[PDB]
Amino acid sequence: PAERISKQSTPFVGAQIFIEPGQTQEQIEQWFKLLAESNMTTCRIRMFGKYMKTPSGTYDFTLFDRAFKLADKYHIKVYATLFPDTEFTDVGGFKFPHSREHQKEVEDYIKNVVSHFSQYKNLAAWVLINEPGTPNLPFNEPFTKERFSDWKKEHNFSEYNEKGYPVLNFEKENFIIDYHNWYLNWLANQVRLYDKQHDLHVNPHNVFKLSGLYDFPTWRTFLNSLGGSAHASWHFGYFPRKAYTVAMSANAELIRSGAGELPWLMTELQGGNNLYSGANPLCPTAEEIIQWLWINFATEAKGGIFWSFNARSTAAEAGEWAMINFKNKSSDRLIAAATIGKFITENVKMMSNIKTLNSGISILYNHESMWVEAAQTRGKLNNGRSIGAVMCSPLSYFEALSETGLQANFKEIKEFDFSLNDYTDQVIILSHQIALDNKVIKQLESFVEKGGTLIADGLTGYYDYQAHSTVVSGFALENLFGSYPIEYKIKENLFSLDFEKDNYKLPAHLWKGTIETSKATPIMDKEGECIACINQYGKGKVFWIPSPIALGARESKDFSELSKLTVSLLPNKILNDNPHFDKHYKDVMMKSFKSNGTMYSLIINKSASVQTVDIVGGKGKAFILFANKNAHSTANKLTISPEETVIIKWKN
Amino acid sequence: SSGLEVLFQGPAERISKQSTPFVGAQIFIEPGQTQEQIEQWFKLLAESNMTTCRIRMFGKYMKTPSGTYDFTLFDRAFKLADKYHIKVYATLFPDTEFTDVGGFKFPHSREHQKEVEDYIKNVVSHFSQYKNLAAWVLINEPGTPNLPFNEPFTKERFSDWKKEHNFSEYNEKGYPVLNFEKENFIIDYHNWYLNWLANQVRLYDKQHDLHVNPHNVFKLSGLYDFPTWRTFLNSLGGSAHASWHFGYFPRKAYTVAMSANAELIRSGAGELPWLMTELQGGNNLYSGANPLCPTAEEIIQWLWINFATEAKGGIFWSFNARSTAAEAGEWAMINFKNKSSDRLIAAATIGKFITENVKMMSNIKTLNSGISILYNHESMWVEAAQTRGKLNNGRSIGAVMCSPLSYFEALSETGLQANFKEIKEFDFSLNDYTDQVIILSHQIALDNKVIKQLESFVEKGGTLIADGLTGYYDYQAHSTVVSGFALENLFGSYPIEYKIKENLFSLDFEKDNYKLPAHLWKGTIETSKATPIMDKEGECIACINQYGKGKVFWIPSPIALGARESKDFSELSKLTVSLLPNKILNDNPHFDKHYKDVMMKSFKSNGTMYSLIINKSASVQTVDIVGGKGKAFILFANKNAHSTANKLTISPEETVIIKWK
Amino acid sequence: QGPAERISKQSTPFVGAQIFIEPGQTQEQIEQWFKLLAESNMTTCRIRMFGKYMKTPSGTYDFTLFDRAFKLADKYHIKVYATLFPDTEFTDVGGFKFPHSREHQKEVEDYIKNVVSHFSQYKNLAAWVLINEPGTPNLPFNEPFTKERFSDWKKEHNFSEYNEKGYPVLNFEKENFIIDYHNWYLNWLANQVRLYDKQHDLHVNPHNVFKLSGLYDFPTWRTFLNSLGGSAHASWHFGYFPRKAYTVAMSANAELIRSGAGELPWLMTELQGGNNLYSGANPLCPTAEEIIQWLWINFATEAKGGIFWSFNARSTAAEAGEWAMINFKNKSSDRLIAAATIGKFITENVKMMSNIKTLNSGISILYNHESMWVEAAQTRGKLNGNGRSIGAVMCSPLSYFEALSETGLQANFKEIKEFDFSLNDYTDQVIILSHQIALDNKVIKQLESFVEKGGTLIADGLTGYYDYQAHSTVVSGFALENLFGSYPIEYKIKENLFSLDFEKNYKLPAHLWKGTIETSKATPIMDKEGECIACINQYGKGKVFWIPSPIALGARESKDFSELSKLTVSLLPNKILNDNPHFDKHYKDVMMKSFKSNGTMYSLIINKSASVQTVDIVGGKGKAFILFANKNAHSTANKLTISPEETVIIKWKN
Ligand SMILES: OC[C@@H]1[C@@H](O)[C@H](O)[C@H](O)c2nccn21
Ligand SMILES: OC[C@@H]1[C@@H](O)[C@H](O)[C@H](O)c2nccn21
Ligand SMILES: OC[C@@H]1[C@@H](O)[C@H](O)[C@H](O)c2nccn21
Ligand SMILES: [Cl-]
Ligand SMILES: [Cl-]
Ligand SMILES: [Cl-]
């Protein structure tokens, strides 16, 4: 009898309801009443073990009963997060058991909480753990140390590869993937001992840094939905604030890819102000709240839940993050969120059946490029010679395509389907993916042979998965690229690649690559060096430019040339069938989606000026369905104000 | 006690609020110095109108191989001081590593405590017999940013303290709390060790004054319970070194830094006399955080600021230099030929002025405007928990002290005195607070008890000015802004939101096109009983509550930090003056308008009023002095200042004393 | 006696490169490297004799991987410098600097026995490198072998906490132990090799010398070496310089090693041959022009070789595909083409190139270990760049060195114990002591003797403020009063950059501290503020110029060496300016150094400015003939027109 989320569910707007001792019945009722009046249907509650434990060690559920009963009274469904006892100062929760004894305390917590709260008819989902993964993994603790020792003994690694060269085996990184898989699957199995009825959910976080911890295809085996925390103040450090549209779109695409056939939703969005908390503190504008909800729904999200409706009262984040003001009335952020909840109720059929319009462009990242980069840059936090270049590179291509109004997937390489017979009009972008193995190179050969277009820039494929450079021993991509690297020469943080005949002046970052072509067509620069090539490989094509041009775009804060070059390489079908911009627009984004056979476009202007965007491609005439600052169109030229969000319905 | 403490006092001087102030210097004594070198120092010190020296009684340089005490090195120095009629402040400094410049702050172990007992017995029993001993300094510079929680003595003391205190993880209403056990222990631990050192000295000498020099006060004030220290001291001192302690200020505002440091120590002293135990006397080569060599002009500025703030002395670190490793040939007032620098010549003019003006200089009482800028330990502790030790700025350690120092600077540039006091040092027991003003600037932690004291203060005619996140938290880091605002009654209003902005933004008021620099966070409120003040966006950003006979001005944006970030205190000056009771502006000499980089402070001696004026601007200034009564007579000026009818013409870096006739 | 030539000061210099040998490489790849190395006019390679790649499971030594490389070297007539490199973690790029334990010392004994006994039999072995890059900033005081050695050393030394006069002192036990510990381990490695091979040269490569010179006792090392080497990598070792002054850095590094070598020949064991991808502190890819500059600077400073790290690249993890002179197709980069031109020049000019003697101007810039140790105690490890940071006691003398380079004057760069203070006459000799903050009574007596016998002494900054125990005689009774004929009065801290304006009309940039003095016998020099800021003392036949403000660090901070150049030239004996070719005036970003071979004088000129320069050369005798120029330089009389990044050799004809 519990409702099960699906790809046909009506999306919801929701908020964390922060429950701690000291709150009154009257305060909590005020929150649920305003939450229901704000067109929110869902809340999330942290089921703190600390606030159910009695002196004698029995479980007292009264604090959480009070909240579940008020949610039920106001017809609000609950996402219940399993959060066992931990220090009051531990804001995010522990990520693994400390010890075998602690594992047994967690077993007991799950037994007690799931057996009790599974009986409430307004329970919508169990969140297995808050925010799996951390930059500070507990290798000091006995539980983790023992698990890592056992894992190493069950794996058979050599210090040399088949040809006899030294290798790195990345035991720690490969263990951490398996360790997350094990603990999340164990938590799922524990819940399922007591409740087989309710959805299981989890919220990976800080995905542009922690994606190397996460094996989403394995997690699909035990989840009913994938979530995510995407907080502007913690997770978007690689972007300026005016590009948090791009950051949220990439974060949504990354989760959507991880989810595969499962529905996804954004478990945490920033609902309010940073006083002392956050790395990049802000108070989201009402305009930002609208931008984030639409970007997520346009990327197939089945929900957006804000951290938080109400604030914590003591120490860390006291009076921070809240959508309500200190009088428990609506901020401009809650008023904005309420307009989106209202829009959904008035447009149920459209909003329940959203499918992202895939351009056929996939930007791929792999765990192994991140792991090899961490070994080579020895943890430096400065450019290409720092942690993060292997994620900033593909995010920069993502930004360039967003400013061209083109959708792009953002996927771990294992989430891409390499099993099809035809890849005509499909495109893969491998931007500074410095580690590729023989198995993945065979998949890319098959993809291109069957009509795929491959774009590769930066140090893509310089190393294999053992940090062995085939560029030195015998280049594994020679066959596919129809060419061979000659040299990298370090330059300044920003330099220009000036193509022969002035066809392009591409900003580039740090390293200039030169190559020698065999089967590929060489592209020369004005200094007479070969800096790029195009290989015809079976029915498909490869464009290779071994200088970092996506990081060059990032460093110059100018994506226009990267946009123009990328558009010139795209199959005609992509530009004919997908609405996009007639040219590059700085600080504008568009993404299109379909619902029940009708096409829609989402447009957001993040520039300081009114913009007239000329939309070309696909079919139909613009009908403005949503526009929070009175945008207007003349033919398919959209006039859109700073910070405005527009939804166009494409008619016949 | 009066006739009894006079029989204890014996032939030793007892410092008092009527003592003649002195100028003095550290005499640095270490092995290898010759009789002839040491005599040269005392002779020049006496000829420079200095009457006092301070000597570090190094345990290291008295300990013999067998463990007995040899006093010869210090006897030689005390005898030469006595020959030249120089009195000695003797610092208790037990044996420690040669590389430990400042000295240990607590015993390392029970065994170490017994070595310290033995040191005190030997040194006090011997040197108490010299007729030129003026004071015992119980410990050099109590307190440190790096407290030794790793060491067994401190670890055990903290364990015992926690067992004797009963803290709950929840408050009366049931909310989670922080108890700040570490910070509350550290207060009690400093109180305990200093009181124990006093008790040890008093076993062997009940005649001589006990003294101590708290240091780096804008950072370490959260370690110091001055009202408790009054129980066992005869005088409070201080180290105020331009190169270590004034990092929150540029050099051109070290006048303001020294005035604030003097006001902070004066407040801590209460009924006890105070003096500045350490002022910077010379050059930083490799030492110091903000290195300098004080100008002759800075030496004169610092001595007058301290005396105008009731100091009974100024002692310079140092007359002569250390010779080996850390600070070798640094900090000295004498040059490498053992002759006067321009700093010693300048200090000598102040010693000479005192001898020619004894009655005036012995009876200085600061002219209290009635403005008190209040800080509390708990705001500093809560800030340290919330900013997780970040070291920039409102989101960093130090905002809770920089905010009140900014108000202090704004008032200095208006020529108005202000007290700078820990909230426990403020007298909340009076029946009438008409024409008194309290400024609570970003004092983020206030408890129910202190809010009741503020309600009483305002009800009885007090004016309360509150800016920044004042009262956002209680003493357990619980925000009543979230649970039910404890200042709603007093403020007649309730916070609505904080929204983070840039480091510097403008508050643009609805009326008069009026603009205030603000830092980092914009506060909005809803008024009940208070009168709202709106901004151009139609949000309420401030209010005035009329509460009994007094008033409250509340602006929950940081406008003092806004003034600091913009490097412009003029608007904060104008706003504060507009909120002051008329009596303050009528009775106190002040500037007719704000003067950037000028300061004035007034004081009284035997019924005559005086003003101290210092110009730190790059230009000659004509300052129009208004308020109080009398005609300007220039008593002191080091660059030929002149007045025409209370308009003073004062040169860059000049220090002026006006006598009001 | 066996087949290998023994290096000497008359050896023909060579160009060479590291050949990086690891498992996985094919016979065909390795042959391609040696063939191209021989075709590039290189005669020498260096090979890291990795213990890891000779150790078998059972603990026996299998030499096959290295035999293959030695046999291909021999086939192409390439001689080998073999570096002793015992087993260590794959991630340990540089190698361990001392044994970890007594048990580890025995494994190293066994490694040396096996490797030296076997490879000593190859006729193309030229040298044993005793250890790669002795010295580290992070000495292993935590490990049992080092801990025990330091305990024993302290028990055998008897230090007092007070000096003779009774003042407290520092004794720098750690620093003094580290000198003796390097001396001991290198001498022990030499003795171990000599158990099995008395025939081949022993070599070692000190590194990062502007930071690690305080670890190195070169005069002791001469007792067990046949040659001194050095690693001088633009991406690791030249942090104190901008890239446009790596000419000055390499010349100073060469002078420092040349001084250390004394009567031994020296060569540069490691020069940067290629690109930094992820490695290096100051990453670059050397230009062809930089390769030519570095080889000529070293040869002009008496180097008997330049070996590049590396010919070919490592393949896995740290430095994979980095540092290589060949490209990823195993063909010549523009760096290898440039190096080949120098190897070809040597073969066509053997008699000249085999007999190079640097033309000593008579100027010696002196540094001492003790100034570096005292600075480390006083700055408590601060890294803020300036006088109040680690490195000022080396940056100060390097700044004087740069000022003299831009005047076209040679200068020695020597540890004070490497200077010969035993001569009877120092007429027309000059010593520069720039911010050498620690001097003891023994060295002051040597300086008194030097000046008395006709020497000129230039002292700036805090020179002589402290003695070797960090005790300031400036405070207790100034030990240099007699020599300087004057006494310090005050130091007053100022801004990072201020001006010293003489009453008569030098305006010298100065850094951080202004010193004032009182003269007795010396002639005072007053500034425009009426303060005495410097003096000239006539002492016996010589003179002293003392300016206790840091004017070399002032030049560095202002990026302007012109005033320091003009002042220094005005103080030099006439004979130096008459007998040595130099520039008629200061030239920013140009350098010249002169040398002699078999009675003929030559000059090396390099232009590092952005523009073509016409340099007027004066002093010495003869007419300029351009022997080498890589960008078509020309001379008219003795005015050389030289392009940006060009290296020129002039032969002086008369
Ligand atoms: O920091 C604000 C909130 C936290 O209070 C909470 O643990 C939540 O899960 C979360 N993830 C990232 C940020 N946040
Ligand atoms: O640093 C100069 C002097 C010290 O030598 C001495 O210990 C003195 O107590 C002090 N407090 C702050 C600075 N100083
Ligand atoms: O870093 C490049 C090379 C190293 O691979 C090698 O160990 C060599 O000894 C060396 N010294 C300094 C730099 N280098
Ligand atoms: Cl939660
Ligand atoms: Cl003292
Ligand atoms: Cl080697």
Side-chain angles (χ1 to χ4, degrees), chain B residues 30-33 37 61 98 283-288 291-293 323-326 328-329 335-337 341-343, chain C residues 162 165-168 170 378-379 387-388 435 462 465-466 470-472 474-476 487-493 513 518:
Chain B
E30 67 178 338
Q33 300 172 337
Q37 284 162 340
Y61 305 148
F98 173 70
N283 184 56
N284 300 112
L285 206 67
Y286 288 102
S287 68
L292 76 166
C293 191
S323 71
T324 297
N335 67 22
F336 298 130
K337 284 281 211 213
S341 76
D342 66 4
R343 299 174 304 287
Chain C
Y162 306 95
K165 316 293 190 203
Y167 287 104
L170 293 181
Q378 294 305 95
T379 64
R388 285 159 54 91
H435 198 57
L462 277 49
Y465 188 95
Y466 311 95
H471 170 263
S472 180
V474 171
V475 181
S476 70
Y487 211 100
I489 288 298
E490 285 191 75
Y491 297 87
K492 292 203 170 172
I493 200 168
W513 305 291
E518 191 168 285

Side-chain angles (χ1 to χ4, degrees), chain B residues 193-245:
Chain B
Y193 187 44
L194 270 44
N195 191 102
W196 180 91
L197 288 169
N199 287 346
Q200 294 293 308
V201 173
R202 282 290 177 238
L203 291 176
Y204 313 106
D205 181 357
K206 301 197 184 56
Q207 300 200 304
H208 293 103
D209 287 336
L210 304 191
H211 185 80
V212 72
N213 58 328
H215 64 112
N216 199 12
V217 295
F218 308 133
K219 289 189 184 169
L220 299 186
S221 56
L223 306 188
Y224 298 150
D225 176 12
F226 294 137
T228 301
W229 296 10
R230 293 174 193 158
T231 277
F232 56 76
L233 294 175
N234 302 102
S235 61
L236 192 56
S239 304
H241 291 307
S243 66
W244 290 118
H245 299 149

Side-chain angles (χ1 to χ4, degrees), chain C residues 18 46-48 83 132 309:
Chain C
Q18 194 82 16
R46 182 174 175 232
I47 299 179
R48 182 155 299 181
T83 304
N132 183 56
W309 191 287

Side-chain angles (χ1 to χ4, degrees), chain B residues 219-508:
Chain B
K219 289 189 184 169
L220 299 186
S221 56
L223 306 188
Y224 298 150
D225 176 12
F226 294 137
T228 301
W229 296 10
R230 293 174 193 158
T231 277
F232 56 76
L233 294 175
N234 302 102
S235 61
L236 192 56
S239 304
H241 291 307
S243 66
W244 290 118
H245 299 149
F246 295 173
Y248 291 149
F249 298 84
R251 182 171 189 172
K252 68 176 190 161
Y254 286 176
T255 47
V256 178
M258 189 62 73
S259 174
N261 199 320
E263 288 287 0
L264 193 152
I265 299 299
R266 179 170 74 110
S267 180
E271 74 287 357
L272 291 190
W274 81 273
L275 58 112
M276 204 63 85
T277 326
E278 303 194 21
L279 295 162
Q280 178 154 354
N283 184 56
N284 300 112
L285 206 67
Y286 288 102
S287 68
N290 304 287
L292 76 166
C293 191
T295 65
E297 288 86 356
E298 276 166 336
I299 297 296
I300 288 167
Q301 288 162 15
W302 298 342
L303 288 174
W304 269 118
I305 287 159
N306 287 310
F307 294 140
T309 317
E310 292 177 7
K312 289 314 206 181
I315 302 174
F316 288 96
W317 191 289
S318 180
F319 197 75
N320 64 309
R322 308 188 189 237
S323 71
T324 297
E327 301 185 355
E330 307 191 35
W331 290 85
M333 297 192 90
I334 72 190
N335 67 22
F336 298 130
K337 284 281 211 213
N338 302 294
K339 299 192 157 214
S340 298
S341 76
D342 66 4
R343 299 174 304 287
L344 186 49
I345 298 306
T349 72
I350 304 308
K352 186 190 192 219
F353 184 94
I354 293 168
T355 308
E356 292 169 356
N357 295 270
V358 168
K359 176 168 161 198
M360 164 200 178
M361 294 300 295
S362 304
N363 293 286
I364 293 173
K365 289 307 183 180
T366 303
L367 190 64
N368 295 343
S369 64
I371 308 163
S372 297
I373 296 165
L374 299 193
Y375 71 86
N376 63 338
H377 298 151
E378 290 82 356
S379 290
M380 181 175 285
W381 303 340
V382 169
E383 173 188 76
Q386 294 305 96
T387 64
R388 293 150 188 266
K390 291 280 178 151
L391 273 184
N392 317 331
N393 188 266
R395 279 160 60 85
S396 73
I397 297 308
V400 158
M401 287 294 307
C402 287
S403 194
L405 289 168
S406 299
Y407 257 110
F408 190 93
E409 185 147 4
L411 288 166
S412 301
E413 289 188 342
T414 320
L416 279 172
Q417 189 274 341
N419 302 324
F420 198 99
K421 313 179 58 63
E422 212 278 334
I423 199 140
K424 288 201 217 73
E425 298 163 357
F426 186 88
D427 187 0
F428 282 113
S429 77
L430 306 186
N431 293 134
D432 179 27
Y433 288 106
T434 318
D435 312 320
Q436 282 225 55
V437 178
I438 285 176
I439 297 175
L440 283 176
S441 188
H442 198 55
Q443 298 309 293
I444 69 177
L446 292 179
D447 72 344
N448 287 334
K449 152 157 193 177
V450 166
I451 292 169
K452 288 283 182 263
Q453 292 174 314
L454 292 168
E455 283 174 349
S456 172
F457 167 84
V458 176
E459 183 160 14
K460 296 171 165 63
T463 301
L464 173 62
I465 299 170
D467 86 306
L469 279 49
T470 289
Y472 187 94
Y473 310 93
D474 74 11
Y475 283 8
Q476 296 180 292
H478 171 75
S479 179
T480 72
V481 170
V482 182
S483 69
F485 183 52
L487 278 162
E488 181 178 5
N489 175 65
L490 188 49
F491 285 7
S493 47
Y494 212 102
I496 287 299
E497 287 188 74
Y498 296 93
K499 298 197 187 194
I500 201 170
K501 306 280 174 207
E502 303 302 305
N503 281 335
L504 184 56
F505 71 101
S506 190
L507 279 178
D508 304 323

